[PDB]
Design an enzyme around this catalytic site. Structure first.
Site, short mmCIF file in Angstrom:
data_model
loop_
_atom_site.label_atom_id
_atom_site.label_comp_id
_atom_site.label_asym_id
_atom_site.label_seq_id
_atom_site.Cartn_x
_atom_site.Cartn_y
_atom_site.Cartn_z
N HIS A 1 0.58 -1.20 0.09
CA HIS A 1 -0.17 0.00 0.07
C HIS A 1 0.73 1.36 -0.10
O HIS A 1 1.80 1.31 0.78
CB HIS A 1 -0.59 -0.21 1.44
CG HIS A 1 -1.85 0.57 1.48
ND1 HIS A 1 -2.83 0.79 0.19
CD2 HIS A 1 -2.69 1.20 2.34
CE1 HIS A 1 -3.79 1.48 0.71
NE2 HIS A 1 -3.91 1.73 2.05
N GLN B 1 3.75 7.70 2.11
CA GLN B 1 3.31 6.46 3.24
C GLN B 1 3.58 5.01 2.49
O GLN B 1 2.45 4.89 1.58
CB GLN B 1 2.18 6.56 4.01
CG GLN B 1 1.86 5.51 4.93
CD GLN B 1 0.54 5.87 5.72
OE1 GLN B 1 -0.34 4.94 6.16
NE2 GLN B 1 0.54 7.00 6.27
N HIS C 1 3.43 1.10 2.84
CA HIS C 1 3.05 -0.15 3.94
C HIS C 1 3.61 -1.36 3.27
O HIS C 1 3.34 -1.59 2.14
CB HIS C 1 1.66 0.14 4.14
CG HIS C 1 1.06 -1.27 4.89
ND1 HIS C 1 -0.11 -1.84 4.79
CD2 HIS C 1 1.69 -1.90 5.87
CE1 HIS C 1 -0.32 -2.63 5.51
NE2 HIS C 1 0.92 -2.73 6.61
N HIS D 1 -11.99 4.61 6.15
CA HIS D 1 -11.30 4.35 7.07
C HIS D 1 -11.87 4.06 8.40
O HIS D 1 -12.80 4.61 8.93
CB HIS D 1 -10.11 5.27 7.31
CG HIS D 1 -9.02 4.94 8.13
ND1 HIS D 1 -8.11 3.77 8.01
CD2 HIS D 1 -8.49 5.37 9.37
CE1 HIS D 1 -7.20 3.63 9.05
NE2 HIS D 1 -7.60 4.52 9.89
N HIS E 1 -10.92 0.97 12.17
CA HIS E 1 -10.12 -0.10 12.71
C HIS E 1 -10.73 -1.15 12.65
O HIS E 1 -11.76 -1.55 11.81
CB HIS E 1 -9.39 0.40 14.15
CG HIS E 1 -8.85 1.95 13.98
ND1 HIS E 1 -8.80 2.56 15.25
CD2 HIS E 1 -7.95 2.20 13.26
CE1 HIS E 1 -8.10 3.68 14.88
NE2 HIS E 1 -7.51 3.43 13.77
#
Length: 309
Positions: free
Chosen positions: A63, A125, A127, A197, A199
């Site tokens: 990602h 970013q 991942h 988004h 969790h």
């Protein structure tokens, strides 16, 4: 540098150039580490990001995110994105997952950066999701190339962020709904992609435009998939007078105590809505952090509630 000798600025024709944004040869030690770097725009005046090209390792990159901001969380060569991404608002511009569509910018649409209002920095970013302990050092230079122009674009892209903050999940409640809603009061934006988004308690996130009590779907998704930008089949015009309203569905099954919507012991209900607006009336960011029309939700379409496993 992975031998790459491409150069951080590449001029193109007169008004354009490409910006290679690449990890400075890093070396990840555990699968699921998010590394971050920053790149300053090379121009102080206003410019327009009009395209991207992923440059990700087939063998380990999961990602990538690109953000636009004025104050990255670090000034070192690179860092762990757990530390932060930007100190100020991290304005998301691009997302990539392995095997997910990348979502290209429509023709004549650019993100505005530089100038008085525009983001001065990009933060990347990457991942890493899949690692062998025998890779010794490796050295990875994953990133993205970005096409910028100073040719003013006719439509300007931005992010409308919907965020939930007043909601709590009592443990064991099977289904818990987090609703968000603000009035739309700018010039028309036209929504063309979206990202969700949440969790690990999140089941489904849906986003809508309500105009005179009729709900039009913007987009719908399980937030435990790769959190890239999903394209909108037909872009949704949102207009002065309309209401934007989302709807995060959570579970508290298996959980001990109340989960909140604020760190990784919390939850989050974010809907990132990517839009274009005609250049002269445009703005690069907007946010909703309220639920101004809660009663309206009793009349929300039934698809908003149905799971996507």
């Amino acid at each position: 540098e992975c031998l790459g000798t491409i150069g951080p600025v590449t001029p193109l024709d007169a008004s354009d150039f490409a910006l290679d944004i690449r990890m400075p040869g890093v070396t990840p030690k555990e699968s699921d580490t998010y590394f971050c770097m920053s790149m300053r725009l090379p121009v102080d005046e206003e410019a327009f990001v009009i395209d991207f090209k992923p440059r990700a390792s087939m063998d380990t990159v999961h990602h990538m995110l690109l953000f636009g901001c004025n104050m990255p969380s670090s000034t070192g060569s690179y860092w762990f994105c757990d530390e932060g991404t930007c100190t100020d608002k991290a304005n998301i511009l691009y997302a990539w997952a392995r095997n997910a569509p990348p979502t290209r910018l429509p023709k004549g649409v650019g993100f505005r950066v530089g100038g008085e209002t525009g983001s001065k920095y990009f933060v990347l970013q990457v991942h890493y999701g899949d690692i062998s302990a025998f890779r010794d050092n490796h050295k990875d230079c994953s990133g993205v190339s970005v096409h910028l122009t100073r040719v003013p674009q006719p439509l300007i892209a931005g992010m409308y962020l919907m965020m939930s903050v007043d909601t709590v999940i009592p443990p064991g409640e099977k289904v818990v709904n987090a609703d968000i809603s603000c009035q739309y009061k700018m010039y028309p934006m036209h929504v063309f992609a979206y990202r969700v988004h949440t969790h690990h308690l999140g089941k489904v996130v849906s986003g809508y435009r309500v105009r005179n009590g009729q709900w039009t779907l913007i987009g719908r998704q399980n937030p435990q998939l790769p959190q890239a930008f999903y394209p909108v089949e037909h872009p949704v015009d949102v207009t002065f007078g309309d209401i934007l309203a989302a709807r995060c569905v959570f579970t508290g099954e298996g959980r001990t105590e109340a989960t909140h919507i604020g760190t990784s012991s919390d939850e989050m209900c974010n809907l990132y809505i990517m839009y274009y607006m005609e250049a002269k009336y445009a703005l690069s960011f907007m946010t909703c952090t309220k639920n101004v029309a809660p009663d309206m939700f009793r009349t929300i379409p039934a698809e908003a509630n149905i799971p996507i496993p």
